[PDB]
Request: fold
Amino acid sequence: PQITLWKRPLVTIKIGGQLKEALLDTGADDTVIEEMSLPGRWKPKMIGGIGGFIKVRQYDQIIIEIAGHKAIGTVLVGPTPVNIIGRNLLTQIGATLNF
Amino acid sequence: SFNFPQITLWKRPLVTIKIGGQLKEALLDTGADDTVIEEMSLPGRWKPKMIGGIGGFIKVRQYDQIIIEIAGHKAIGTVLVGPTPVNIIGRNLLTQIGATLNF
Ligand SMILES: CC(C)(C)NC(=O)[C@@H]1C[C@@H]2CCCC[C@@H]2CN1C[C@@H](O)[C@H](Cc1ccccc1)NC(=O)[C@H](CC(N)=O)NC(=O)c1ccc2ccccc2n1
Ligand SMILES: [Cl-]
Ligand SMILES: [Cl-]
Ligand code: NA
Reply:
């Protein structure tokens, strides 16, 4: 529960009944997962980053387990090359940046 | 929430940096391998490189051993310069300033 940043801060998450690897990403506003199905309603969204924008599906009130911590929040699903846990869920597991 | 900007990540972890004598705002970014800054002049030689983010790849200029102050902490390391929408401090420099992620 202290993470060095000598390497990418990857953790195991559980989402939609599936285990995935994801990056703990303080530079991301949003949580973005590679294509998968999630239950309930969704709406389209455009999100941007270094290269431009991608279109994703926004699912609200999704439960996720991050390095064994349960949280709930919005999850975006779409063609990201890496699963990223952004600040909307990092706050829910109590993550902090310290220096 | 808690202070800089902030620790608990309820707001973007933005800080002031100083590079080539100029102050800029930048984001502390554990998800970024590299540090990427908007167009500016830096000394010395550079080499080109393509870096990828969420949307695709951009071309940037790699400058090595650049002096940069990050929220008052001195670092000397590699800076990539190019059309990034936000100035990014990545793990190459977060480790120099002793940043850690805790949960
Ligand atoms: C900076 C660089 C070295 C290229 N690294 C990266 O970009 C890696 C690439 C990885 C593979 C692709 C999937 C994401 C990961 C993590 N990212 C870091 C990652 O932290 C990246 C850094 C960043 C921040 C702001 C603007 C641009 C880029 N964040 C993001 O990609 C998130 C995605 C999101 N919507 O949550 N972007 C934002 O949170 C965000 C915020 C403000 C913005 C203003 C204008 C335009 C775009 C903006 N995007
Ligand atoms: Cl949320
Ligand atoms: Cl470096
Ligand atoms: Na929902």
Notes: Helices of chain B lie at 91-94. The two ends of chain B are 17 Å apart (CA to CA). Chain B has one helix and eight strands.
